[PDB]
């Protein structure tokens, strides 16, 4: 007997189009999403060209509208040159993305003053999310307080980070955060198996104590999000391995396994993959949209999942329980038992729906 | 005709005793202070052993009382093991020092949670100062707000940092800061002359734009302090150059030169080398203590100053105007024209004076 879930939302995916389409494109990435029981994705701006200006956004929107099989919103990315220039297109984006650590020359910010400039100029009602590790979390929280607005912290990976966020919440500060599945289900203990190439990810895999702290502090975690970051095996195993794991197809099965084991409830999962993503990002409902899962089916994750062009997975060999059987998206069957049945272009830009605009004072 | 100044205070010196006495000791460092018109110093805890517990403090206090020629207070250093253990000795120290960037294994803090622990456990009325560069400034400011207390930022060196502090002050946050002379009078332009060994310092020398930003934002700077960090020329020119410049003997002459040129006023200098150090650290007055300077005397800084055992200086070849002629400390002539006339042990621990305790509620 199947359990019906609402359409789940992944607010952190890298779909690689434009410019990296050997790694993934909108059509393949959204197929991966559907197979993972996800019906709406928020795509990150670190493409080539990066989505850091109106023309790049315009290109990305058309590519997504033509290629996406599920619904989507696109992030804008903060650069060292675009603060104060995104006003006219800001409302059309998922939100603004700040890359506060490593980064490519284009999204690199070299001074906290540039962060402040973005917080001051980006419309105050629209989401801001940050890649912020370790002390960077504290630093970006400070910038948010100086400018008296909220911030969302991507992929919390460490005890240090989740305890900091916990303390901020206890003081009533407007901060929310997300955790990715690799930081709940993999740790240092897995690096021997993965190797130094495949195992490369940012934030890096944590200690068993980091992983335990995230579970113990589940109340502090607002969202789960995959940080789906596909790279080919050639790239991961090559001389300069880029960081990132694919994750869309494995996220829900891993979490359903955890639910089956009583590590969190079905409600806890649905807050973090549906209700909280909606409310933090003001994403609209999807009419006639639902996911049917089989919670009894035991299987072992294989060396690669069917849809992502990454064609590998760091979870290979893990035993899980729970599988996506059927997805319906806006009244059409989108996925059944390993077959995606909606074509590239079926997906729509949710920010163009009347219900998908973020409310604001005139 | 000479100008009489009050006894100046340097709240950031490394005197290297115990454990590094080839670089400097209390007697040589305080001779250097007196020759620079400084009558009270606050000595940092990164000695060997480091001053991170009661026994180490007890040793350092006796060595200082036996060796110091001017008056002093000693900082305690925060470690990964001593939060919540310094309560009984805290009031006897200058304050608590947090080393938030590089550091030796002993003062290294590995998580922002450890910073929070120190802010929560150190007595709330006593000073906390931090070595905090770039985004670390924002991060430690966040920790200070979470724990609702003040913080003092050591050696601000960059435009980024001074503008951040400026923004924090504009929001009424309790933050103060200090700037060292090398970050006002040296820049990248000097690295060719200094070389990569001698030029090694933390925070590193800034661009001309960093230097200009510090001057333009002088209103934001509460104190000047030397970060006197003596190392021998052998060390600076060797294979693994330690960071740091000696500075006690050159700080006042460089600043007097700037006053003579109208870059700041005599009052601005005396706020930053006397009144603000007193009030931030609650340091007591020194009876019958004053410094006589000749503002007309032009000279060129030589390859080493007379007293510091560092026996080199990064300011060699700079033309200055202004010199210390006479220092009187507590009614005794301590320095005249290149001769120190008070012996090692003349200096006292100001925290033991009845007026030198930090006021607190019972
Ligand atoms: Zn990220
Ligand atoms: Zn994210
Ligand atoms: Zn990402
Ligand atoms: Zn519900
Ligand atoms: Zn320092
Ligand atoms: Zn300092
Ligand atoms: Zn120092
Ligand atoms: Zn005065």
UniProtKB/Swiss-Prot annotation, chains A, B:
Active site per database record: 227
Binding positions (Zn(2+) 2): 12, 154, 178
Organism (species): Homo sapiens
Protein name, UniProt field: Multifunctional protein CAD
Phenotypic consequence of residue 154 to S: Reduces dihydroorotase activity
Modified residues (N6-carboxylysine): 97
Effect listed in the UniProt record for changing residue 227 to N: Abolishes dihydroorotase activity
Localization, UniProt: Cytoplasm; Nucleus
Residues of the full protein shown: 1460 to 1821 of 2225
PTM statement from Swiss-Prot or TrEMBL: Activated by MAP kinase (Erk1/2) phosphorylation just prior to the S phase of the cell cycle, when the demand for pyrimidine nucleotides is greatest, and down-regulated as the cells emerge from S phase by protein kinase A (PKA) phosphorylation.
């Amino acid at each position: 007997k199947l359990v019906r879930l609402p359409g789940l939302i992944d607010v952190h995916v890298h779909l690689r189009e434009p410019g990296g389409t050997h790694k993934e494109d909108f059509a393949s990435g959204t197929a991966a999403a559907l197979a993972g029981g996800i019906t709406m994705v928020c795509a990150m701006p670190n493409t080539r060209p990066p989505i850091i200006d109106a023309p790049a956004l315009a290109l990305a929107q058309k590519l997504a509208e033509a290629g996406a099989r599920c619904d989507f919103a696109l992030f804008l990315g903060a650069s060292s040159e675009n603060a104060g220039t995104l006003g006219t297109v800001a409302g059309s984006a998922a939100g603004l993305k700040l890359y506060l650590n490593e980064t490519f020359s284009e999204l690199r910010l070299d001074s906290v003053v540039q962060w402040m400039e973005h917080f001051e100029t980006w419309p105050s009602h629209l989401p801001i999310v940050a890649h912020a590790e370790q002390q960077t979390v504290a630093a970006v929280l400070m910038v948010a307080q100086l400018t008296q607005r909220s911030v969302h912290i991507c992929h919390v990976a460490r005890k240090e980070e989740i305890l900091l966020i916990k303390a901020a919440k206890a003081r009533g500060l407007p901060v929310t955060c997300e955790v990715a599945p690799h930081h709940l289900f993999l740790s240092h203990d897995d690096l021997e198996r993965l190797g130094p190439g495949k195992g490369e990810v940012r934030p890096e895999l944590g200690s068993r104590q980091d992983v335990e702290a995230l579970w113990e502090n589940m109340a502090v975690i607002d969202c789960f999000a995959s940080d789906h970051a596909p790279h080919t095996l050639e790239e991961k195993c090559g001389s300069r391995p880029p960081p990132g794991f694919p994750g869309l197809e494995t996220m829900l099965p891993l979490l359903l396994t955890a639910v089956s084991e009583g590590r969190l409830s079905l409600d806890d999962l649905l807050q973090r993959l549906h209700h909280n993503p909606r409310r933090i990002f003001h994403l609209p409902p999807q009419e006639d949209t639902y996911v049917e899962v089989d919670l009894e089916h035991e299987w072992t994750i294989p060396s690669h999942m069917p849809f992502s062009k990454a064609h590998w997975t760091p979870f290979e060999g893990q035993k899980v329980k729970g599988t996506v059987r059927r997805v319906v998206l806006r009244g059409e069957v989108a996925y059944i038992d390993g077959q995606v049945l909606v074509p590239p272009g079926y997906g729509q830009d949710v920010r163009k729906w009347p219900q998908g605009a973020v409310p604001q004072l005139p």
